[PDB]
Amino acid sequence: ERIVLVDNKCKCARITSRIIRSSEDPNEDIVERNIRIIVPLNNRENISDPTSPLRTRFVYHLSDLCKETCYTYDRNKCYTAVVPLVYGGETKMVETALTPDACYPD
Amino acid sequence: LHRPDVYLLPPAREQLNLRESATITCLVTGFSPADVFVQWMQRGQPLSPEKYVTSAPMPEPQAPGRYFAHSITVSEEEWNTGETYTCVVAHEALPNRVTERTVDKSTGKPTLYNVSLVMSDTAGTCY
Amino acid sequence: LNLRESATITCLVTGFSPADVFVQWMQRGQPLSPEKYVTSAPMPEPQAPGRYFAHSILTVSEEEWNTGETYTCVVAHEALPNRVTERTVDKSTGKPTLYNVSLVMSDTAGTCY
Amino acid sequence: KGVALHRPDVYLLPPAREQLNLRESATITCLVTGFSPADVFVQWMQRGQPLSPEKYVTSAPMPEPQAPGRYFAHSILTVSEEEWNTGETYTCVVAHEALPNRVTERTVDKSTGKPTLYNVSLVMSDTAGTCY
């Protein structure tokens, strides 16, 4: 029986715990904590604005996230800007899509 | 008048190895004024009064105004599943007079971790 | 511990008949003043009729607790063969807590969520 | 009038490192591939400032070998090497009816181009955590 404590996807962490029943021994059951993280390795300090430097120093407080510039993107949430593209005579002041398959309307 | 503090103390292993029983407590302290309620809840059903003993709000030597109290038994082979033995505290100086905290058998000191973290370039969207 | 202001240590005595036990705290060879600790009065046990239980609470700052110290709890009751027993604590009284940390670097290896 | 609006894929390629040895100039490019139909407008923005059209020359779409329906084209810009030595990232825009927004943007500079050094200094602490 694995119990998921927090699955905060902004930091992309899957903190979760399990109990392991031992052999024919007194029931002083052990406690285990599997942790797995994901780092973009290619993103920047600001995940949306294309001006911040590259991600160099990473901080993972395993208590703060369980309640704030979260590193990885999300399945649906994203930030996007607007270009001055005109597209010839027919003016096209069109909103853009910074993240493909993630900035789609939802 | 101020914020009570609640902590959980799991039974010591030396008590459990006797294979006779276990004792679980959640200490409440650093609260003012006195006359603070405590209730024991398990699996959503109320716990019978006799299986727990509640102390009185005595003062503590360090903080004069603040008060502290105590509450406390299960069979040895019952806590192995935990059931987390929830205790809720009802104090006047609380948002909703509820500051529930609970700890199960799994909750506690971890013997080992085997923390296996992965990392790779093809990321950035929490795939 | 995680708020870093002070800590409390508790000594539990259980399953004694009759009443009138004695408890105090021994500090690495020298006693402490009585007001630094609070001893709960004897209380009848619900399950066991003739047995009793009691608590002793001692509060001391975390900063000095970061140093080892002994902080021994000593109890005297007639039922004991020598009429006196005691125990001790420390921050090192925990467990080894084996680690099995594994880390993978290659982006080529297949990853799962 | 009979062509599916396939997703116009856009890639950015930076000047080769060997080109940055004689300290003469550089050459960025953006290529669009796998789309239909033609008549796609492409240009570069420099931190939101429009770039002079004469500074760059784009290509004309031609049929893709593998997929006849898909087309592809290139746009090439030439800049000085010290401009990249100072950073000064740019972005290449697309104008094709396939995308609902009809526009996508990228970003190319020294940092994003083949980082030879990996300064990873991750910190992990408080393994117990407060997660309740």
Residue numbers in the entry:
A (entry chain J): 3 to 69, 98 to 136
B (entry chain L): 449 to 520, 522 to 576
C (entry chain K): 464 to 576
D (entry chain A): 445 to 576
Reproduce passages from the article.
Human pentameric immunoglobulin M (IgM) binds to several types of PfEMP1, including VAR2CSA via its Fc domain. Human pentameric IgM in a low resolution cryo-AFM study revealed mushroom-shaped architecture that consists of 5 copies of monomeric IgM and a J chain (JC).
Our structure also shows that DBL3X and DBL5ε directly interact with the Cµ4 of IgM, possibly leading to the steric hinderance in VAR2CSA interaction with its receptor. Further from the overall view of the interacting surface, we observed interaction between chains E, G and K of IgM with I chain of VAR2CSA and chains F, D and B chain of IgM with M chain of VAR2CSA. Similarly, chain F of IgM interacts with DBL3x, chain D of IgM with DBL3x and DBL5ε and B of IgM with DBL5ε, suggesting very similar interactions on both faces. We observed that although they have an overall RMSD of 1.367 Å, both structures align well between the ID2 to ID3 domain but have major changes and movement of corresponding residues in the DBL5ε domain. However, Ala2280 that is distant from the interacting surface showed a large movement of 55.8 Å away from ID3, reflecting the huge shifts in the C-terminal domains of VAR2CSA and also suggesting that the regions away from IgM shift more than the region that are closer to the interfacing surface. The clockwise and anti-clockwise rotation of the two VAR2CSA molecules on opposite faces of IgM juxtaposes C-termini of both VAR2CSA near the J chain, where IgM creates a wall between both VAR2CSA molecules and hinders its interaction with its receptor.
